[PDB]
Amino acid sequence: SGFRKMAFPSGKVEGCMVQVTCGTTTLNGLWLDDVVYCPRHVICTSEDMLNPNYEDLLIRKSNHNFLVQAGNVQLRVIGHSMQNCVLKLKVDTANPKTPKYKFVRIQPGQTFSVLACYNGSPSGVYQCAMRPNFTIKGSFLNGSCGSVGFNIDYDCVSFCYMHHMELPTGVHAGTDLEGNFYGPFVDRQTAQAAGTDTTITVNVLAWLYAAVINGDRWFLNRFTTTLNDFNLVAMKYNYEPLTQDHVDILGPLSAQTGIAVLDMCASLKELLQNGMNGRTILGSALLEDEFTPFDVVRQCSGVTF
Amino acid sequence: SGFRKMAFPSGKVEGCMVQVTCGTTTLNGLWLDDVVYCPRHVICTSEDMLNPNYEDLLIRKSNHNFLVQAGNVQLRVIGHSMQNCVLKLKVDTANPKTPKYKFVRIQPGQTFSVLACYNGSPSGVYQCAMRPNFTIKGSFLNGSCGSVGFNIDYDCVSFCYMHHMELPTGVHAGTDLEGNFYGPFVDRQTAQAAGTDTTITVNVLAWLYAAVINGDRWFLNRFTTTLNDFNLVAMKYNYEPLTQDHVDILGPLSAQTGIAVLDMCASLKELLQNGMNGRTILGSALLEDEFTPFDVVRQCS
Numbered sequence: 001s002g003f004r005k006m007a008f009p010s011g012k013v014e015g016c017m018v019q020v021t022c023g024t025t026t027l028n029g030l031w032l033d034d035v036v037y038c039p040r041h042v043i044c045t046s047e048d049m050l051n052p053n054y055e056d057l058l059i060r061k062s063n064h065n066f067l068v069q070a071g072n073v074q075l076r077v078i079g080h081s082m083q084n085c086v087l088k089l090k091v092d093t094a095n096p097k098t099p100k101y102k103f104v105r106i107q108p109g110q111t112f113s114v115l116a117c118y119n120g121s122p123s124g125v126y127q128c129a130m131r132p133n134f135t136i137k138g139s140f141l142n143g144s145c146g147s148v149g150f151n152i153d154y155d156c157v158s159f160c161y162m163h164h165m166e167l168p169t170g171v172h173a174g175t176d177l178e179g180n181f182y183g184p185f186v187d188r189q190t191a192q193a194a195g196t197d198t199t200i201t202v203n204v205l206a207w208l209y210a211a212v213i214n215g216d217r218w219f220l221n222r223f224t225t226t227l228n229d230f231n232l233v234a235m236k237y238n239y240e241p242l243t244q245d246h247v248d249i250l251g252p253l254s255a256q257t258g259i260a261v262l263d264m265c266a267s268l269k270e271l272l273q274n275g276m277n278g279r280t281i282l283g284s285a286l287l288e289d290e291f292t293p294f295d296v297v298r299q300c301s302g303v304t305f
Numbered sequence: 306s307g308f309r310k311m312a313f314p315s316g317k318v319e320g321c322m323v324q325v326t327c328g329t330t331t332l333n334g335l336w337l338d339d340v341v342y343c344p345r346h347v348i349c350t351s352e353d354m355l356n357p358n359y360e361d362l363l364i365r366k367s368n369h370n371f372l373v374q375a376g377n378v379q380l381r382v383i384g385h386s387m388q389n390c391v392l393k394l395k396v397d398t399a400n401p402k403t404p405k406y407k408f409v410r411i412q413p414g415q416t417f418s419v420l421a422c423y424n425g426s427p428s429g430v431y432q433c434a435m436r437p438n439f440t441i442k443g444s445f446l447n448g449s450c451g452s453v454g455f456n457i458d459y460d461c462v463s464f465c466y467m468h469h470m471e472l473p474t475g476v477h478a479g480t481d482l483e484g485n486f487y488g489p490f491v492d493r494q495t496a497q498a499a500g501t502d503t504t505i506t507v508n509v510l511a512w513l514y515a516a517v518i519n520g521d522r523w524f525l526n527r528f529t530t531t532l533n534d535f536n537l538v539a540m541k542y543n544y545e546p547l548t549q550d551h552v553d554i555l556g557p558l559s560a561q562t563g564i565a566v567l568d569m570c571a572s573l574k575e576l577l578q579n580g581m582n583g584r585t586i587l588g589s590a591l592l593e594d595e596f597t598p599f600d601v602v603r604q605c606s
């Protein structure tokens with residue numbers, strides 16, 4: 001019993017974290033095989049960030065300008081190239097702790113674990129979701145750039161995020177491991193703002209199924225609804241639309257609990273129009289949307305890595 | 306900016322997780338140097354579980370009855386001994402991935418990371434507090450016994466918890482790494498119940514300071530309170546009493562934010578009286594008590 005916000009075991013990723021220094025800027029790099037990936041803004045000073053020409057800045061750099069440190073060992077940079085907003089530093093040594101890995105781009109609503117690092121040293125691990133406005137509500141201080149988000153599938157690490165910046169509202173923005181930003185963000189010192197966030201509906205339903213599996217049933221009702229009537233109500237409360245794919249993905253939890261997805265949507269519809277009325281669900285007074293249906297199945301069934 | 310429930314990186318502990326099998330029972334062990342630590346209830350035949358005599362059961366066991374598996378390698382048990390509710394299986398191989406470590410017993414209110422495991426394989430990592438009633442509100446299934454709680458403050462792993470059992474209310478009980486249970490619990494199937502839980506007041510105050518550091522100020526008020534008046538109100542909401550030690554520990558956050566501890570205590574009294582009125586503090590509609598003053602300073606700097 002119990003339900004916790006749970007991250008993947010971070011060990012396979014800790015063995016990849018390195019410190020990357022370029023001039024006065026120090027941030028984190030991800031060392032996989034003989035390449036170190038890091039945000040390209042490491043090559044920028046305070047003025048450069050205002051309006052940077054990264055191709056122009058990178059051409060002026062030499063391999064010896066990048067100081068890569070893996071533990072107490074300095075790695076020697078033998079090449080440098082840029083892929084979108086990520087810098088790739090070729091090193092002479094392949095990381096012996098390189099796990100089986102893939103670079104994957106995730107969709108909004110998908111969750112991942114963040115290994116927050118400072119000076120190439122892992123300091124914490126937390127579970128979060130890619131918000132529908134493409135930001136992440138992370139916990140990051142100065143020096144956390146280059147920290148990565150990942151999932152684990154069997155024995156393979158799927159790297160899905162690299163931290164680049166913090167928006168004025170305290171939310172965070174970054175890229176996939178190919179340097180493509182999630183969201184309409186740029187890696188510049190300019191006025192940027194996240195769009196109005198919405199609730200990840202399929203995740204709320206998955207979390208309501210986890211609450212039922214844990215014995216919390218007060219919100220269940222006799223009612224069902226159509227996907228169309230639910231979506232009309234949900235859109236009014238700034239909830240993301242629920243697609244037939246989402247209904248299908250919730251199938252196993254629906255079968256395990258005996259509550260159909262449209263039956264659970266009728267519970268969710270009431271929860272929105274009436275509130276919790278002093279009650280909680282899994283110790284929470286708000287509907288939690290950072291657990292995907294797969295996260296719920298993994299936790300409520302004990303999948304190991 | 307931002308505030309998250311954050312666990313320590315679990316790598317140093319993953320390299321220590323092994324599977325321990327004794328008869329039909331399989332659970333997790335912690336492999337440090339040439340010793341594997343695990344709950345002593347692994348030697349019980351479920352029929353012994355109501356009133357087990359563990360000294361009697363352990364004396365009947367031989368080293369070849371314990372099957373220890375580290376990854377795909379079977380370790381050879383060359384000795385067995387018991388320290389309180391923990392079984393120590395001496396193995397013929399020192400764990401090469403043994404980190405710098407210590408065994409620490411924690412107090413209620415303290416937080417730690419849990420590496421939940423099944424069959425010696427880590428499946429997830431999360432953050433807990435030792436509740437004032439000495440239970441932990443974990444997420445554990447059958448087979449999670451032997452999963453450990455830890456803190457990793459600078460290079461060294463401090464092991465503070467080993468999971469032993471789930472109480473009838475879904476909460477969890479376990480021991481320190483010396484086998485001493487936290488709380489009035491025993492490793493028997495006898496009727497056991499956790500005491501009524503209370504809120505860790507010092508942690509709520511620390512979290513209110515984290516919210517102020519993050520720009521949340523709506524709950525602040527012009528009032529202050531005596532420590533005794535605060536405890537009288539707090540006890541009525543099933544909040545733990547706040548001692549002078551707790552006031553002292555909140556000193557650095559008080560200095561950083563410019564809000565005296567008793568000034569923040571008056572905000573907390575108002576929050577308990579009115580509720581949040583549709584507002585959230587750090588994205589939460591409830592007062593969070595699983596961040597210690599030390600966690601807040603470490604996370605916020």
Ligand SMILES: CC(=O)N1CC[C@@H](C(=O)Nc2cncc3ccccc23)c2cc(Cl)ccc21
Nearest residue numbers: 041049140141142144164165166187188189306
């Ligand atoms: C203004 C500026 O030049 N910066 C700052 C450094 C950097 C940045 O956002 N860093 C931070 C990341 N994560 C949490 C942070 C909490 C506090 C401070 C900084 C954090 C950055 C990166 C880009 Cl791509 C664009 C702009 C900026």
Ligand SMILES: CC(=O)N1CC[C@@H](C(=O)Nc2cncc3ccccc23)c2cc(Cl)ccc21
Nearest residue numbers: 001346354445446447449469470471492493494
């Ligand atoms: C009742 C009983 O004989 N058991 C069960 C096995 C075991 C126990 O609590 N196991 C579990 C742990 N953590 C979550 C669990 C969720 C579901 C099931 C079992 C879980 C145990 C350990 C002791 Cl020390 C005393 C009693 C018992």
Ligand SMILES: [Cl-]
Nearest residue numbers: 109202292293
């Ligand atoms: Cl999803």
Ligand SMILES: [Cl-]
Nearest residue numbers: 517518561562
């Ligand atoms: Cl402040």
